[PDB]
Paper text:
The main protease of SARS-CoV-2 (Mpro, also referred to as 3-chymotrypsin-like protease or 3CLpro) is responsible for the majority of nsp processing, cleaving at 11 conserved sites along the polyprotein including self-excision of Mpro by autolytic cleavage of its own N-terminal and C-terminal autoprocessing sites. SARS-CoV-2 Mpro is a functional homodimer of two symmetrically disposed protomers that are each 306 residues in length (33.8 kDa). The active site of Mpro features a Cys145-His41 catalytic dyad, which orchestrates nucleophilic attack at the carbonyl carbon of the invariant P1 glutamine and the formation of an acyl enzyme intermediate central to efficient peptide cleavage. Using C-terminally substituted Mpro chimeras, we have determined X-ray crystallographic structures of Mpro in complex with 10 of its 11 viral cleavage sites, bound at full occupancy intermolecularly in trans, within the active site of either the native enzyme and/or a catalytic mutant (C145A).
C6 (form 2), C10, C14, and C13WT have also crystallized in space group P21 but with a distinct unit cell, two molecules in the ASU, and a unique conformation of the donor substrate (we term here form 2 - see also below). Interestingly, the others diverge from this canonical binding, we term here form 2: in C6 (form 2), C10, and C14 (crystallized isomorphously in space group P21 with two molecules in the ASU) the substrate sequence is kinked ~ 90° at the P3 residues and tracks instead between the dynamic Met49 and Gln189 regions. This altered substrate trajectory appears to be coincident with the close contact of the donor C-terminal domain in this crystal packing. P2 valine, unique to cleavage site C6, also maintains a highly analogous set of interactions with a markedly similar S2 pocket, but with a less optimal vdW interaction surface as a result of the gap from the static pocket edge to the shorter beta-branched side chain of the P2(Val) C6 variant. This P2 pose is also remarkably maintained in the kinked form 2 structures, including C6 (form 2) which we have captured in both binding orientations. No major altered side chain amide rotamers are observed in our collective 52 structural visualizations of P1 over the varying substrate products or acyl enzyme intermediates, remarkably even amongst those with markedly varying main chain conformations such as C6 (form 2).
Residue numbers in the entry:
A (entry chain B), B (entry chain A): 1 to 306
The structure:
Amino acid sequence: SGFRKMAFPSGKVEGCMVQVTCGTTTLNGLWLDDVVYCPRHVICTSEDMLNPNYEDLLIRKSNHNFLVQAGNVQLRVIGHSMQNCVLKLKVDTANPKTPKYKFVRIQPGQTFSVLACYNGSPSGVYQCAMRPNFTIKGSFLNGSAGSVGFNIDYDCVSFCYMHHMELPTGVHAGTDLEGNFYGPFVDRQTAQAAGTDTTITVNVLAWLYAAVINGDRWFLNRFTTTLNDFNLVAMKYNYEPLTQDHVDILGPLSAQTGIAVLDMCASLKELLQNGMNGRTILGSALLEDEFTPFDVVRQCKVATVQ
Amino acid sequence: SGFRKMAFPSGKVEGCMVQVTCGTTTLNGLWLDDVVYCPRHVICTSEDMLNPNYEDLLIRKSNHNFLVQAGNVQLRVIGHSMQNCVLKLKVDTANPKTPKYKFVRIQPGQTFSVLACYNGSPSGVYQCAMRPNFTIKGSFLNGSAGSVGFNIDYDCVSFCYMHHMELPTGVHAGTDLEGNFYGPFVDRQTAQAAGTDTTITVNVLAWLYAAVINGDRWFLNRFTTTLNDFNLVAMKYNYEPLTQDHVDILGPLSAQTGIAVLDMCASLKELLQNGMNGRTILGSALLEDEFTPFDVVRQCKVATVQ
């Protein structure tokens, strides 16, 4: 029993992290086979960030302008190119610790693990969710760009996020591993802002099921509702509408607890309207939305099969 | 910016995890050089756990009775001994992935990263604190015993916890890597009560500093108090006494923010006596106590030196 914010083990990703230096600018790269992937603003000085002309800046860089280090090992750059907002640096050495991997592009609501790195050195691991507004609520300082987000299944690393930038609300934006930003964000100088975020309803429901599985059930009532009725409540409180697909995905949690999904929706409606009144759920005094149904099933080993 | 529950990168520990099976009982072991460390209850079945003569039970076990698998590949046991509540199984193969390591005893209030494992396979990583009542609020199911807790300092892994058991309140107990339990617990099947837990005051202060560093300053009003007056309030709210030693270790956070420790104590006193006014701090609607001062300094790279 118990329930914690849990990341995937990070070892398979640690062996892929390198430092990339161009002049005086440094960030992290991801070394898979004989390519290092990193954010393209490594080619910018502080002066360039007034208005970076990335294509013009890159044309004056040779292979020798890129210093790539895996720990103390120097990886010689033998080619370079730009793909959307990432650079691909071809190196002379293939990474012997390259795991089985895929590059994937995820949807809002999905969670992933982040290996935060500085100067090519892994510092820590934590869990993030892709927010409905395509930001993430990470923990990133200057020098962390190029840190990646990932999930692991059957020893295959699915890389879904490369970190690029921080917005003045304290939230983070980045790309897939082909260099395409999530959301409307750009790595230019435009005075941009994130859209209004909402709460990930299906994840809150998953977390309420985790709470019941772990014995916290004071919030259960006898009532039920419908998708139509519940979604009027969701709109009022800035929650994402619940879809029937979400209801179906919650199936294994409903199956193991015996609590119908629309019954759990009626419990959530009451929590939204009246709050918790000095009580907690899984150690929290607010409704948590960064655990997916998959996250709960995996961490609590939810199964009716024996 | 940002502030997350952050674990150390787990790769160095992943390569040490193995499965130990004795009869129908399976749990995890820690493989360092030519020794596997695991909880001694692997030698027990339902038949002999109320009053297990572990010395007698171990005598009935030969080296062949211990099946050790590293990545589903068998390691041959060539010796076995018991040290307090752990077994040391000598194997004929030294682990080529053994990191630099130390076995350490942590103090109450200190944090560590847990690599949760089942059948020798790492499942996830999360952060825990050693509670004042010497339990931990983990996430552990049957088969997770032998999972370990650790911190990393300069490529040295300091192992501080090996998981053994769950108390009926849903919290967890275990040993150091010398096999001595934290707190008044035994691996015997006696009914065991944890002491009433208390809140880790110095950690709440550290987390309030983390909030300030991240821009969350609504609870600062330039008030200050004395150490004795603060400790009178702490006592009323089930908070641990704050010692001058605790004040000292908050130094780096006070240094970067310019907020004296006793000013932050006055802020915390106000939050305790009057509540959080419905507000959230760093994504929490309650006061969080599982970040140490060092955790904040590490994650936020706190320093006045440039």
